[PDB]
Design an enzyme around this catalytic site. Structure first.
Site, mmCIF file in Angstrom:
data_model
loop_
_atom_site.group_PDB
_atom_site.id
_atom_site.type_symbol
_atom_site.label_atom_id
_atom_site.label_comp_id
_atom_site.label_asym_id
_atom_site.label_seq_id
_atom_site.Cartn_x
_atom_site.Cartn_y
_atom_site.Cartn_z
ATOM 1 N N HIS A 86 14.228 16.350 16.772
ATOM 2 C CA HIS A 86 14.873 16.145 15.476
ATOM 3 C C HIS A 86 15.288 17.456 14.798
ATOM 4 N N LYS A 90 27.191 7.564 15.276
ATOM 5 C CA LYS A 90 27.976 8.693 14.772
ATOM 6 C C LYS A 90 29.463 8.366 14.728
ATOM 7 C CE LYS A 90 26.377 11.415 17.936
ATOM 8 N NZ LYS A 90 25.374 10.464 18.503
ATOM 9 N N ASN A 147 32.312 16.742 18.257
ATOM 10 C CA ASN A 147 31.593 16.142 19.379
ATOM 11 C C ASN A 147 32.535 15.855 20.548
ATOM 12 O OD1 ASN A 147 29.393 15.213 20.806
ATOM 13 N ND2 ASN A 147 29.302 13.204 19.801
HETATM 14 N N1 LIG Z 1 22.916 2.043 12.425
HETATM 15 C C1 LIG Z 1 22.685 2.134 13.737
HETATM 16 N N2 LIG Z 1 21.477 2.581 14.145
HETATM 17 C C2 LIG Z 1 21.208 2.598 15.454
HETATM 18 N N3 LIG Z 1 21.980 2.211 16.472
HETATM 19 C C3 LIG Z 1 23.175 1.793 16.040
HETATM 20 C C4 LIG Z 1 23.601 1.734 14.722
HETATM 21 N N4 LIG Z 1 24.924 1.311 14.656
HETATM 22 C C5 LIG Z 1 25.258 1.135 15.913
HETATM 23 N N5 LIG Z 1 24.248 1.401 16.802
HETATM 24 C C6 LIG Z 1 24.263 1.253 18.256
HETATM 25 O O1 LIG Z 1 24.790 2.441 18.817
HETATM 26 C C7 LIG Z 1 25.867 2.109 19.712
HETATM 27 C C8 LIG Z 1 26.869 3.232 19.744
HETATM 28 O O2 LIG Z 1 27.430 3.357 18.416
HETATM 29 P P1 LIG Z 1 28.374 4.600 18.142
HETATM 30 O O3 LIG Z 1 28.944 4.460 16.774
HETATM 31 O O4 LIG Z 1 29.439 4.689 19.230
HETATM 32 O O5 LIG Z 1 27.354 5.810 18.209
HETATM 33 P P2 LIG Z 1 27.470 7.308 18.737
HETATM 34 O O6 LIG Z 1 28.889 7.773 18.345
HETATM 35 O O7 LIG Z 1 26.424 8.067 17.948
HETATM 36 O O8 LIG Z 1 27.223 7.249 20.269
HETATM 37 C C9 LIG Z 1 26.392 0.792 19.181
HETATM 38 O O9 LIG Z 1 27.131 0.141 20.209
HETATM 39 C C10 LIG Z 1 25.100 0.080 18.780
HETATM 40 O O10 LIG Z 1 24.439 -0.455 19.928
#
Ligand SMILES: Nc1ncnc2c1ncn2[C@@H]1O[C@H](COP(=O)(O)OP(=O)(O)O)[C@@H](O)[C@H]1O
Length: 429
Positions: free
Chosen positions: A180, A113, A136
């Site tokens: 979901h 995200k 968030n």
């Molecule tokens: N396209 C993706 N699908 C699934 N996991 C991902 C993807 N891109 C990144 N990640 C994983 O999610 C981790 C957190 O990414 P981040 O952008 O900070 O997500 P969030 O803001 O949803 O916590 C990354 O360090 C990587 O391990």
């Protein structure tokens, strides 16, 4: 108490600010006797009525709307009584959705995200938009509201979407779903959607009746972003148009190429021109501890993905970076697994890893799930994990910290784990 802010914390204080700066009458309640933010509220807004302790249901029913902190149970009996009595069970995003006067890009998902949000944010800035980015864990959405904004880019949690009746986003996406319906509330009133061709749980019912753009790693059709392979090189692409070779990005791993394509789809839906989006893409270096390059040593690269704190995240990074290097991964994993089923890591590890180095509380659980898929090494410390990983790696490999676990068993947080990993890597001879 025409309006009541129910629960203090980050968002609750942004509701206090928003309602007060707008002059509206309101009170604040909280269930805890001495909530952490009580002193800050009592000092910064001494004129606001604040009631701490068991929620007075009669007081809550004296409001027309309750703005409930996201991480507070909506099953609280007084909230249930207020909801049973007809009071609007609301929250900061619900209020924001009704007050916003510019189109909203709305982003949720299990992972990626903040990566995609910040990238769309940088695209919008490059397009000279008067943009506001938040939601968030970042800037509270209500702090963004102003008539001069031309575009809102909001990262949203499921909890924030729970009390949002109709977000009415200009374009909305659930980037991915991994262990979901709460997430799909982001589509209520959405005028466009962006879906992930690789994750069927990202496609909403309304994708049949509003503009539907997609992203994925395969060759794209119409209204799709994907990868085109030509001259042995892979390109980000929109339909049949090659946009940029992935080698001109500064972020690595096919999961990050997917994130770039998701951001392109979102920006395209709100009219960001491609030249601006592509310029921002070339300048985007990713967020801290999201698969970040640390060092190249004796033909081996080292990547800090400490923010992979769940199995879905690690799986994407393992497959993502594994498909983006000349060699094999040496994976560092382990920590506090929070009861996760680690079995989904077995196939990606068997496919992409030369070996896995395990540390932390749940190293044994991960070992049980991985079985004899690849050589495993158990260590006690992060320093030793890095030293052993370097000895196992061969030229062309990448050493990847993508632990699939929280860090709190050994570290203050995932940032500290990533920093200490990078430190150990930089201290290798
Ligand atoms: N396209 C993706 N699908 C699934 N996991 C991902 C993807 N891109 C990144 N990640 C994983 O999610 C981790 C957190 O990414 P981040 O952008 O900070 O997500 P969030 O803001 O949803 O916590 C990354 O360090 C990587 O391990």
């Amino acid at each position: 108490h025409f309006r009541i802010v129910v629960g203090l914390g980050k968002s609750g204080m942004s509701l206090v600010r928003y309602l007060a700066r707008r002059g509206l009458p309101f009170a604040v309640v909280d269930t805890r006797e001495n909530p952490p933010e009580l002193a800050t509220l009592r000092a910064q807004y001494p004129q606001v009525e604040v009631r701490c302790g068991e929620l007075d249901a009669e007081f809550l029913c004296s409001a027309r709307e309750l703005y409930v902190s996201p991480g507070l149970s909506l099953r609280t009996p007084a909230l249930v009584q207020a909801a049973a009595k007809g009071v609007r069970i609301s929250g900061d995003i619900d209020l924001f959705a009704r007050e916003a006067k510019a189109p909203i890009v709305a982003i949720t998902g299990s992972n990626a995200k903040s990566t995609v949000t910040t990238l769309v944010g940088e695209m919008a800035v490059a397009a000279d938009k008067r943009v506001a980015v938040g939601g968030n864990l970042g800037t509270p959405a209500l702090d963004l509201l102003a008539d001069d904004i031309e575009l809102y880019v909001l990262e949203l949690s499921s909890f924030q979407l729970e009390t949002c009746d109709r977000l009415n986003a200009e374009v909305a996406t659930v980037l991915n779903v991994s262990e979901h319906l709460a997430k799909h509330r982001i589509f209520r009133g959405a005028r466009q959607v962006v879906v992930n061709r690789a994750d069927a749980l990202t496609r909403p019912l309304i994708a049949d009746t509003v503009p539907c753009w997609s992203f994925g790693l395969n060759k794209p059709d119409f209204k799709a972003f994907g990868l085109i392979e030509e001259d042995g090189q892979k390109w980000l692409a929109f339909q049949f148009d090659k946009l940029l070779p992935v080698g001109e990005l500064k972020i690595r791993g096919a999961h990050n190429y997917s994130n770039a394509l998701a951001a392109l789809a979102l920006g395209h839906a709100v009219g960001l021109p491609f030249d601006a989006m592509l310029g921002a893409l070339k300048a985007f270096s990713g967020l801290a501890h999201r698969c970040q390059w640390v060092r190249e040593r004796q033909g081996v690269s080292y990547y800090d993905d400490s923010k992979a704190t769940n199995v879905g995240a690690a799986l994407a990074a393992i497959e993502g970076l594994g498909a983006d290097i000349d060699g094999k991964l040496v994976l560092l994993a382990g920590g506090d697994g929070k009861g996760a089923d680690f079995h989904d890591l077995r196939e990606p590890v068997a496919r992409f890893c030369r070996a896995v180095v395990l540390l932390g509380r749940d190293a044994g659980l991960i070992a049980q799930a991985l079985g004899n898929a690849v050589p495993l090494v158990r260590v006690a410390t992060l320093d030793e994990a890095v030293r052993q990983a370097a000895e196992l790696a061969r030229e062309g490999d990448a050493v990847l910290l993508s632990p699939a676990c929280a860090s709190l068993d050994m570290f203050k947080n995932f940032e500290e784990r990533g920093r200490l990993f990078a430190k150990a890597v930089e201290e290798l001879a």
